[PDB]
Design a protein around this ligand. Structure first.
Ligand SMILES: [Cl-]
Ligand SMILES: [Cl-]
Ligand SMILES: [Cl-]
Ligand SMILES: [Cl-]
Ligand SMILES: [Cl-]
Ligand SMILES: [Cl-]
Ligand SMILES: [Cl-]
Ligand SMILES: [Cl-]
Ligand SMILES: [Cl-]
Ligand SMILES: [Cl-]
Ligand SMILES: [Cl-]
Ligand SMILES: [Zn+2]
Ligand SMILES: [Zn+2]
Ligand SMILES: [Zn+2]
Ligand SMILES: [Zn+2]
Ligand SMILES: [Zn+2]
Ligand SMILES: [Zn+2]
Ligand SMILES: [Zn+2]
Ligand SMILES: [Zn+2]
Lengths: 86, 88
């Protein structure tokens, strides 16, 4: 899946993330390299495919894809979102 | 192109013990183990191997995000600074 990060926010207010708002505050590589603490920003949104996650939800999804070269099961993702999404 | 990642619950980084190949692999986390317990990511004993080096989760997290989101690892000088801030 395509993956990107942005500081648009809106997840904790359960706001729908629009492509336009996401892109207006997308984080570039150099920007993240200059300030890696961005990973802890409350407004950080992670785009994974068509969905938008907070970092706490995206982290296991992402860790699994790189460590095992395949996504987690569908039932696992549902459980992570249930546990971790705002 | 991206470096390989493995995870283990061998621990030892925060006591500054040397991470041995045997200790890492004997307690390596498998796909089904992580799929059954994704909270392992918060386990205090989690060690993340990135290429040749061993990190705790707090250090590995930005490395992992940069690789996935930008499809390239962070610069080496950046990783060194993350280590100073986040390694135990
Ligand atoms: Cl912000
Ligand atoms: Cl379903
Ligand atoms: Cl279902
Ligand atoms: Cl979870
Ligand atoms: Cl949980
Ligand atoms: Cl240990
Ligand atoms: Cl534990
Ligand atoms: Cl445990
Ligand atoms: Cl443990
Ligand atoms: Cl120390
Ligand atoms: Cl210490
Ligand atoms: Zn902020
Ligand atoms: Zn389902
Ligand atoms: Zn959980
Ligand atoms: Zn100890
Ligand atoms: Zn444990
Ligand atoms: Zn250096
Ligand atoms: Zn820092
Ligand atoms: Zn220490």
């Amino acid at each position: 899946p395509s993956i990107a990060i942005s500081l648009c926010g809106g997840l904790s207010d359960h706001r729908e993330i629009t492509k336009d708002a996401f892109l207006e505050q997308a984080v570039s590589y150099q920007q993240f390299a200059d300030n890696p603490a961005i990973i802890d920003d409350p407004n950080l949104v992670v785009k994974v495919g068509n969905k938008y996650y907070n970092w706490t939800t995206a982290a296991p999804l992402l860790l699994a894809m790189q460590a095992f070269q395949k996504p987690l099961p569908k039932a696992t993702v549902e459980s992570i979102m249930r546990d971790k999404m705002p």
